[PDB]
Amino acid sequence: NNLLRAIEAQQHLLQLTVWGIKQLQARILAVERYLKDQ
Amino acid sequence: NNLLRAIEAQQHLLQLTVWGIKQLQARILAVERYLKDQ
């Protein structure tokens, strides 16, 4: 049970890191494009 | 025991990815602000 609970919580952590990476990728891409456009 | 050890090591990996995401977020934010300011 403890191991299952740990995996469950770690999956939530993974989902949070994925959210963060997706937002950072969009933001860096927007900056790269801004600089190209300028 | 093996599963516990794997979870423990994976938690350290998660912590490392969190460190990295936090630093990248700060750095992209600083760039976004620099460009806004310019």
Binding site: N2, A9, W19 | -
Partner: peptide, 29 residues
């Protein structure tokens, strides 16, 4: 998701991390 801030993100990360620590500690006893 689109309604979440980076401060909230850090809070949620911290909360799950602390929970996992507690679970792993209890697995040792």
């Amino acid at each position: 998701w689109n309604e979440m801030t980076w401060m909230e993100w850090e809070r949620e990360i911290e909360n799950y991390t602390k929970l996992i620590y507690k679970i792993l500690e209890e697995s040792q006893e």
